[PDB]
Design a protein around this ligand. Structure first.
Ligand SMILES: Nc1ncnc2c1ncn2[C@@H]1O[C@H](COP(=O)(O)OP(=O)(O)OP(=O)(O)O)[C@@H](O)[C@H]1O
Ligand SMILES: [Mg+2]
Lengths: 80, 644, 55, 109
């Protein structure tokens, strides 16, 4: 399945443009995919524990928000 | 015992390339070069990337043997420039530049080469007119030959020049007639088939490994072995002497290698190289006083803390006891609410903290207060005495259990150790699991919201009385440096201490004694060179190429009767036998393989060109200045000892 | 007894096989019968084999 | 001090620059671009076709101790002898793993 390859090179380009990056080595795209997957694993792992300890099968936005704040990366807009 | 039985180590000082003496110009050679018969004199120069050798063809050994290096610099405080052009470069500022491209046989810094040639002719006493024989790389590049011959004709103006291959001059000096010439030099390793004194250079092969690469690879290895930091300055000139003095070719590599770091006899397989080093009561009483006072004060703090805990926790026990008494006295409806004064729901909970308080104190008008404080000390003293009695009673039972039931008693301690080992391994695994990911705690906390001394003691008793137990079983031995491969690799059979300046600043060679030469035989495995090994190259030539070649006759058998070894980098122990036994398996059974070493395999390549220099075969190959001015510097007279 | 350095079907019956020990290599001409015995066993180049020439 | 004087004497005694060369023709002067590397020479020339590859399967050796290696670590791609060396290899300073590869001409990228 390997849906990490669905994070295409242009999508990684635009994230770098918003990051203010002018020239991108062609080796960046594989390194960025590894970075993203390592991050996104950690958040979902934490979120699923809030879901299960609330005795739910559905992971909720506040499960994600608590996982993010637990990681020090507080996200506003989805809930208090 | 295992190391204390060994003698003090034999250790060899580092060796490096160094300046040794002044060589005044050898004017006697210049006079003899004029007295010798007409046309029977030449300057013979061997372009060794490790050593330029130069001298007179009519002489049996060269006058010079000089590294192809220059060092030119401005002495800023004195304004004069200096330049040096051999071992006069102290290989002391060492602005050294080398004529050759590193790891190749080809000259590339012509300013350096021109300064080396300048040094040569000065030291030969040139007062200028003399023919030059110059050795050359196999398949040497045309541009490189053009540049060298331009220097010889335009700058130095010499009358005639001839180029020949150093390995083929060496073969001729050893009565070579037909054979396989195997050269290993500084730059490279070559296999040349020679048929009827003529080299079949279209069938020559190069390995791109040689004595330079061995010194470079040995340096990479020593830097990795001591990656923690070796405090001596590791240099390629030092590893070049290490590869010479200590390396040798293995007669059977894998069976020798796999046991090389095995602990017995390692002090024989290991050789130790010493880098240079330098090494260097009232305060002792004062330190001991401070240590005594600070130690006592800490014990006073612990005793005060414990004695403080004694009164508090005993009164908390009395506090819990009075809660129990009131709980037991008052109506049953009061039980939980009264025990909630002890913040606990039931005596089944309160007994837990009661026991922990009892354990802790067990483990640990003002005259009325002082007596009450004295009572707390006395109460713990009784608990201490009862604890010691309980331990002594348990010891007395274990004594009789050991004396009567020893086999069962020891089997208990073995199984207890196994349990304690499993408990420690579970605890060690837990200590690896704990903090493997910080959020482990915060994840689990939401579920709520919404051995060392024992193992040692068991081991010590088994060492005391289980005659089948032994120290190597203990976890202590399982962590001893004496049981570690990386200590043997880096430091050998002796214990090591970083306090000794003498025992730091020494390198232990070990596996690289044999691993370094074997890159010739296993290049892609040992150093990634991605080329066929020497035995596979020589086997390809003898077995695949020469029998197919149409003009040749008696192949392989004519070439196979003389596999000839040339160049300094062949001088390893067992190099010849290793090459023989490798080829022997590739050849038809009983084939008359001989492998032979050159005499004096370094200088012998020069002696061949000196002997050859003025023969009629050579003088038919000489190019004159007036030919060069028309033909240019790339053009050469093809001859049996030179390139096409 | 040797490592099979070559297996060259000669006819289309005869095989030639090359065998090598640490001490040299030898070629053998194989009758189609002993060839198919060598081929009924799963011998390939790089295998080590034992042959009895007469039996 | 005599040591400085003696060294100054020896460097003057060894120097070639103080020595005039009668054989050296002054009129010829080299092209300043003449120092070229093998790649430049070969690239401009486009007989050093004497190198040879190999087809046999290579043996596996421990990148640290050089002893034979049954194991290739999937993470750092160092070859290693045993569990003791695997422990070291995973504990290496982050730059060190690429040096063990590079000692056999390998690199991770
Ligand atoms: N006894 C010895 N054992 C092993 N190696 C040695 C020994 N003596 C010298 N060497 C090494 O042999 C090399 C010298 O090789 P050789 O003299 O054949 O080369 P060269 O003519 O200078 O170079 P080239 O022909 O490649 O330009 C050096 O690396 C030196 O350290
Ligand atoms: Mg040479």
């Amino acid at each position: 399945r390997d849906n990490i390859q669905g994070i295409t090179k242009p999508a990684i380009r635009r994230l770098a443009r918003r990051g203010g990056v002018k020239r991108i080595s062609g080796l960046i795209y594989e390194e960025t995919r590894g970075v993203l997957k390592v991050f996104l694993e950690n958040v979902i792992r934490d979120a699923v524990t809030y879901t299960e300890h609330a005795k739910r099968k559905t992971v909720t936005a506040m499960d994600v928000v608590y996982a993010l704040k637990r990681q020090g990366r507080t996200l506003y807009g989805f809930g208090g | 015992e295992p190391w204390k039985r060994l003698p003090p180590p034999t250790v060899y000082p580092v060796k490096e390339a160094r300046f040794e003496k002044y060589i005044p110009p050898q004017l006697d050679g210049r006079e003899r070069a004029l007295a010798q018969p007409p046309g029977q004199v030449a300057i013979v120069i061997d372009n060794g990337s490790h050593s330029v050798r130069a001298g007179w063809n009519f002489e049996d050994k060269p006058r010079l043997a000089i590294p192809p290096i220059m060092s030119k610099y401005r002495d800023r405080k004195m304004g004069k420039t200096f330049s040096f052009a051999g071992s006069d470069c102290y290989a002391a500022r060492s602005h050294i530049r080398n004529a050759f491209e590193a790891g190749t046989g080809i000259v590339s810094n012509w300013d350096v080469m021109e300064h080396v040639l300048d040094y040569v002719f000065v030291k030969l006493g040139m007062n200028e007119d003399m023919p030059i024989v110059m050795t050359e790389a196999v398949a040497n590049l045309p541009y490189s030959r053009k540049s060298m011959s331009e220097i010889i004709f335009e700058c130095y103006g010499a009358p005639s020049l001839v180029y020949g291959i150093d390995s083929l001059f060496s073969f001729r000096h050893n009565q070579g007639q037909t054979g396989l010439v195997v050269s290993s030099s500084y730059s490279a390793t070559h296999v040349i088939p020679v048929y009827n004194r003529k080299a079949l250079l279209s069938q020559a092969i190069r390995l791109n490994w040689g004595g330079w690469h061995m010194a470079e690879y040995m340096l990479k290895l020593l830097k990795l072995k001591y990656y923690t930091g070796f405090p001596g300055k590791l240099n390629s000139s030092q590893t070049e002497h290490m590869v010479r003095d200590f390396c040798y070719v293995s007669l059977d590599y894998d069976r020798e290698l796999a046991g090389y770091l095995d602990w017995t006899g390692l002090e024989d397989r290991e050789r130790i190289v010493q880098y240079p080093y330098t090494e260097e009561e009232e305060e002792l009483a004062r330190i001991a006083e401070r240590k005594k006072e600070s130690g006592r004060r800490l014990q006073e703090q612990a005793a005060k803390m414990r004695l403080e805990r004694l009164m508090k926790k005993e009164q908390e026990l009395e506090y819990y006891k009075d809660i129990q008494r009131r709980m037991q006295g008052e109506s049953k409806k009061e039980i939980k609410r009264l025990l909630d004064e002890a913040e606990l729901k039931d005596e089944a909970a309160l007994e837990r903290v009661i026991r922990d308080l009892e354990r802790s104190i067990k483990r640990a008008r003002q005259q009325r207060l002082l007596k009450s404080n004295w009572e707390a000390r006395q109460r713990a003293k009784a608990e201490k005495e009862a604890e010691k009695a309980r331990l002594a009673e348990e010891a007395r039972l274990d004594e009789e259990r050991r004396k009567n039931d020893l086999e069962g008693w020891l089997e208990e301690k073995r199984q207890l150790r196994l349990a304690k080992l499993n408990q420690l391994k579970e605890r060690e695994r837990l200590k690896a699991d704990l903090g493997n990911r910080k959020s482990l705690a915060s994840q689990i906390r939401m579920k709520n919201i919404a051995l060392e001394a024992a193992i040692r003691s068991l081991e010590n008793d088994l060492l005391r009385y289980d005659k089948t137990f032994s120290y190597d079983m203990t976890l202590d031995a399982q962590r001893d440096w004496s049981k570690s491969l990386l200590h043997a690799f880096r430091y050998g059979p002796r214990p090591f201490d970083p306090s000794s300046q003498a025992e730091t600043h020494r390198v232990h060679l070990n596996v690289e004694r044999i691993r370094v030469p074997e890159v010739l035989f296993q290049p892609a495995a040992i150093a990634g060179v991605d080329q066929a090994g020497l035995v596979e190259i020589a086997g390809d030539i003898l077995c695949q190429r020469l029998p197919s070649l149409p003009g040749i006759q008696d192949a392989p058998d004519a070439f196979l009767r003389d596999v000839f070894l040339t160049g300094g980098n062949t001088l390893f122990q067992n190099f010849d036998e290793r090459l023989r036994q490798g080829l022997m398996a590739l050849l038809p059974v009983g084939a008359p393989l001989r492998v032979r070493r050159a005499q004096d395999a370094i200088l012998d390549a020069w002696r061949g060109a000196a002997g050859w220099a003025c023969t009629e075969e050579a003088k038919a190959a000489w190019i004159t200045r007036e030919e060069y001015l028309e033909k240019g510097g790339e053009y050469i007279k093809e001859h049996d000892l030179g390139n096409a | 007894e040797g490592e099979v350095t070559e297996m060259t079907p000669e006819e289309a019956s005869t095989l030639l096989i090359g065998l090598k020990s640490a001490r040299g290599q030898k070629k053998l001409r194989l009758d189609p019968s002993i060839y198919e015995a060598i081929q009924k066993e799963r011998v390939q180049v790089g295998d080590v084999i034992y042959i009895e020439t007469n039996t | 001090q005599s040591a400085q004087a003696a060294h100054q004497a020896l460097v003057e005694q060894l120097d070639l620059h103080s020595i005039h060369k009668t054989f050296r023709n002054p009129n010829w002067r080299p092209n300043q671009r003449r120092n070229k590397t093998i790649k430049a020479i070969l690239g401009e020339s486009q007989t050093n076709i004497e190198s040879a590859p190999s087809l046999a399967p290579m043996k596996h050796y421990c990148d640290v101790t050089g002893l034979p290696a049954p194991y290739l670590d999937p993470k750092t791609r160092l070859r290693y002898h045993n569990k003791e060396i695997f422990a070291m290899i995973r504990n290496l300073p982050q730059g060190m793993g690429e040096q063990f590869l590079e000692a056999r001409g390998a690199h991770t990228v």
